Amino acid sequence: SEALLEICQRRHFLSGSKQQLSRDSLLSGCHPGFGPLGVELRKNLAAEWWTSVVVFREQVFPVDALHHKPGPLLPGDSAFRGGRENLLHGALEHYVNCLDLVNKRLPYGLAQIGVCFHPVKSIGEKTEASLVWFTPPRTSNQWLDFWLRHRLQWWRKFAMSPSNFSSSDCQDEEGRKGNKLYYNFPWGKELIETLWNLGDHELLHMYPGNVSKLHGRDGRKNVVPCVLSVNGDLDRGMLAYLYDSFQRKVLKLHPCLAPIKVALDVGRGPTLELRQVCQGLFNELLENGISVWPGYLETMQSSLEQLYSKYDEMSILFTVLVTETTLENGLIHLRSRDTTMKEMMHISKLKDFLIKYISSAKNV
Amino acid sequence: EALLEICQRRHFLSGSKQQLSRDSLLSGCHPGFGPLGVELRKNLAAEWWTSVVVFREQVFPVDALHHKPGPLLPGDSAFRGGRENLLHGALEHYVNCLDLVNKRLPYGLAQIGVCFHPVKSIGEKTEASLVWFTPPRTSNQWLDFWLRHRLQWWRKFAMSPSNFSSSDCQDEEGRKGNKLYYNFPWGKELIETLWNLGDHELLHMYPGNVSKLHGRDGRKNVVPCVLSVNGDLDRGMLAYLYDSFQHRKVLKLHPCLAPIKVALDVGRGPTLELRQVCQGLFNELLENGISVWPGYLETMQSSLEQLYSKYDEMSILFTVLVTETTLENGLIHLRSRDTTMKEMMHISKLKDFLIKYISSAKNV
Numbered sequence: 001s002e003a004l005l006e007i008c009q010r011r012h013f014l015s016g017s018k019q020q021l022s023r024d025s026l027l028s029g030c031h032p033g034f035g036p037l038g039v040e041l042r043k044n045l046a047a048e049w050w051t052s053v054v055v056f057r058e059q060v061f062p063v064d065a066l067h068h069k070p071g072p073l074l075p076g077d078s079a080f081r082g083g084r085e086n087l088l089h090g091a092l093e094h095y096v097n098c099l100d101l102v103n104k105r106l107p108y109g110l111a112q113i114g115v116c117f118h119p120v121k122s123i124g125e126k127t128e129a130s131l132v133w134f135t136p137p138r139t140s141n142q143w144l145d146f147w148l149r150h151r152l153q154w155w156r157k158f159a160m161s162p163s164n165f166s167s168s169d170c171q172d173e174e175g176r177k178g179n180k181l182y183y184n185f186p187w188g189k190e191l192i193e194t195l196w197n198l199g200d201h202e203l204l205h206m207y208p209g210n211v212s213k214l215h216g217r218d219g220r221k222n223v224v225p226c227v228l229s230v231n232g233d234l235d236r237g238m239l240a241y242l243y244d245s246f247q248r249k250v251l252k253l254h255p256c257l258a259p260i261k262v263a264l265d266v267g268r269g270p271t272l273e274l275r276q277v278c279q280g281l282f283n284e285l286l287e288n289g290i291s292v293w294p295g296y297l298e299t300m301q302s303s304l305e306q307l308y309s310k311y312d313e314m315s316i317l318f319t320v321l322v323t324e325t326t327l328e329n330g331l332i333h334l335r336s337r338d339t340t341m342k343e344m345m346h347i348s349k350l351k352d353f354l355i356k357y358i359s360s361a362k363n364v
Numbered sequence: 365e366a367l368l369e370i371c372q373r374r375h376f377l378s379g380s381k382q383q384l385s386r387d388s389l390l391s392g393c394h395p396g397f398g399p400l401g402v403e404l405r406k407n408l409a410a411e412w413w414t415s416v417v418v419f420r421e422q423v424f425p426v427d428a429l430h431h432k433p434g435p436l437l438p439g440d441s442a443f444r445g446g447r448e449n450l451l452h453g454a455l456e457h458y459v460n461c462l463d464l465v466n467k468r469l470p471y472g473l474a475q476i477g478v479c480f481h482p483v484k485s486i487g488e489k490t491e492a493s494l495v496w497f498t499p500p501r502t503s504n505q506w507l508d509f510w511l512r513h514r515l516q517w518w519r520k521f522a523m524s525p526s527n528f529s530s531s532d533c534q535d536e537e538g539r540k541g542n543k544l545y546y547n548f549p550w551g552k553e554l555i556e557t558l559w560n561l562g563d564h565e566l567l568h569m570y571p572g573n574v575s576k577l578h579g580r581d582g583r584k585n586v587v588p589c590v591l592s593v594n595g596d597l598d599r600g601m602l603a604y605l606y607d608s609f610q611h612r613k614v615l616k617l618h619p620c621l622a623p624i625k626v627a628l629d630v631g632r633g634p635t636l637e638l639r640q641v642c643q644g645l646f647n648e649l650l651e652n653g654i655s656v657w658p659g660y661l662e663t664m665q666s667s668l669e670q671l672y673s674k675y676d677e678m679s680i681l682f683t684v685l686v687t688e689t690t691l692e693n694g695l696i697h698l699r700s701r702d703t704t705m706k707e708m709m710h711i712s713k714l715k716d717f718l719i720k721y722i723s724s725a726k727n728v
Binding site: 012033043058059068122125283297298 | 396428433446461
């Protein structure tokens with residue numbers, strides 16, 4: 001029973017009047033959408049998942065699975081319009097050609113990140129992140145044991161209290177054996193990801209006919225793969241990550257995640273020169289790939305308290321202020337979203353600063 | 365013919381010589397893209413966003429939807445919800461997300477996302493659209509502003525900018541707009557739309573109350589002119605791929621655009637102790653934001669030439685080799701692509717090299 005969800009509108013993480021902010025609407029995927037920051041938080045979040053599963057470990061590749069389903073369909077079932085339910089289906093279909101992609105060796109998976117449609121009657125839109133891992137029966141229980149473990153330490157990575165993220169085992173959906181990751185929300189836990197061991201089923205359903213046209217070599221042993229589908233919902237995550245950045249107000253979000261890094265403005269200074277060197281910096285930063293809020297284009301001052309208590313209400317790692325005292329040396333000063341402190345620093349070092357503060361937090 | 369067939373064999377597209385063929389493509393019908401088609405499109409994506417959405421921060425990311433439940437108007441062609449563009453979606457923010465610049469005009473809402481259109485059948489198109497709101501006074505100047513800009517964007521990546529035509533045009537729900545066309549082999553095709561609509565659609569969006577939409581043009585409180593700009597990333601991806609071809613194959617595609625930049629495996633060598641260095645680079649480069657095709661995993665050495673005609677058939681800027689005359693002194697030989705040149709080079713000074721080859725290239 002908090003207001004955090006409001007702050008998500010006042011600072012644009014969410015859109016819509018106080019009605020549409022119905023925890024349902026949100027959870028169930030029937031909200032009107034996110035505000036600029038949210039988007040970024042999601043775009044930001046996602047890439048972090050792409051770099052955490054596609055980048056480094058590559059012999060896994062991106063797949064473009066359509067949104068709707070043309071042609072025929074099945075007898076009844078609670079489905080509307082014909083658009084994708086999940087991202088797995090599209091993935092599978094590719095399995096046979098992209099199988100060439102790895103000189104036909106296993107294991108190997110296809111990744112994608114897109115929006116999926118769940119009916120609730122009205123529709124729902126959720127941005128899920130999926131990787132359909134094909135496996136050699138031999139090491140099938142093994143990889144599941146694997147990912148799960150891995151995937152968990154991922155989310156906990158960015159948390160300010162990781163232990164609210166937990167794992168669980170379970171069985172028989174489309175086969176026994178499976179896992180689930182949850183985020184604990186003040187009211188209760190909710191599902192943010194699914195990890196099942198599809199076995200050679202579905203796949204065989206999709207490809208009736210031959211058994212050889214598939215089964216990619218194992219270790220000289222040509223065997224029909226075991227479909228392992230890992231599908232995690234990004235909106236409900238992006239949503240989870242937020243409560244984790246709250247209890248003053250302030251949104252303590254893990255840097256690499258933040259919708260925007262630093263924001264700069266102006267203090268006891270004139271104008272031109274201020275928003276002179278300012279322009280330069282704005283460009284210096286984005287140049288080096290850093291999100292910056294051009295506060296310096298704003299009006300008055302709105303005090304500094306008003307200003308600080310919004311930037312915090314927006315999760316802006318840092319808040320740097322430039323005053324005429326700058327143009328005579330290179331002295332500006334930043335206020336840490338957290339340490340609420342305001343050291344001073346030499347502008348030109350600002351650049352390499354944020355770069356490493358992030359470059360650091362990134363490792364940790 | 366020629367090129368196309370390649371785009372499948374080298375996984376840029378998915379499907380037989382049937383599915384893939386003009387109509388199927390143009391008409392956003394083809395079944396999809398391979399892990400390469402992806403990247404190129406993906407690169408072309410941000411490569412756009414960092415050419416419009418980033419800088420000039422007064423342009424923000426939006427999150428329109430894909431369907432429109434609830435009451436709307438009954439007639440013409442569409443599919444229950446299924447968006448036809450990002451514009452209507454966008455507008456649904458102009459009010460709320462105006463409190464982002466305190467009504468200060470001009471200012472724009474951008475978003476990239478797949479839209480859907482009738483072909484009956486369904487055509488999917490990744491669209492990049494900027495919804496720019498502007499004071500009646502500058503409306504033209506901006507339309508003219510963008511056109512010239514937008515155009516330079518395309519010609520900038522082409523290896524024959526003189527195949528990228530732009531033409532003036534009038535009438536619609538607004539006077540004046542623009543069209544961008546690429547010089548495919550069968551004539552010209554539309555890939556971009558620049559329309560100065562005027563407050564029209566807007567007022568229909570928001571009837572009755574008129575002050576609720578004033579934007580402070582200077583000190584003035586006035587209502588904006590929606591200049592909608594919409595390009596086709598897919599139909600474009602098809603352009604650049606074509607503007608990079610015309611046994612002499614090699615897809616001479618531009619760098620910060622190329623799906624995979626550097627390739628890599630081994631020549632006159634053994635294994636592992638080598639494929640151990642091939643993890644020292646791989647892991648490095650990715651860590652540096654560089655696309656690398658993990659050659660070394662390959663098997664049957666099978667021709668030194670077979671690779672070059674493949675890597676060229678893939679469009680991989682450079683191709684780097686690791687042999688025995690390496691491990692000892694560290695020297696590794698890399699090839700080119702376009703320039704089909706070759707050279708020695710300490711394995712160390714390589715990550716730096718590429719980083720700049722593309723880096724400087726992006727500076728043109």
